[PDB]
Amino acid sequence: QLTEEQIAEFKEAFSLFDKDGDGTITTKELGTVMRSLGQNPTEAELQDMINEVDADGNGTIDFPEFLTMMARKMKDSEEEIREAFRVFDKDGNGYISAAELRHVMTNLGEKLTDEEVDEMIREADIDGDGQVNYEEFVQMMT
């Protein structure tokens, strides 16, 4: 009942956290992502977050643990896309700039070039104004 597409969806999300590929999400990797997403997690609540799903008490989340907690709550996905846009559009102007998109991928530790970023916008920017609006952003996600 867990489709092959949902699992790969969860695997790709896990690999975003697991920047070093060691198969585990640490407090560092969790906090790094949360900051790139505009939040400022306290180092203690980072610990409390890992603690809720760490079943074997090693202070890390691995993929099956990650899978277990994502699979429990698959109840329905549009506001998800909307909120995601609100994260990327820092100046609330309704458009995601290249710099607004750079400052997230840079913060994520994606290790992408400024041209690589600019090609991501280019693929997404349909009307050609150099920026990604919400409806362009929807098609990019979906």
């Binding site: 790709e12 809720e52 799903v53 896309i81």
Partner: peptide
């Protein structure tokens, strides 16, 4: 190319983690 859709589910994973803690704290 497969980065951006993963960001959507990454966000959901954080909401769930924060909910699990808040569930405990209450």
């Amino acid at each position: 190319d497969d980065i951006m859709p993963a960001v959507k589910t990454v966000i959901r994973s954080i909401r769930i983690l924060k909910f699990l803690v808040a569930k405990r704290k209450f």
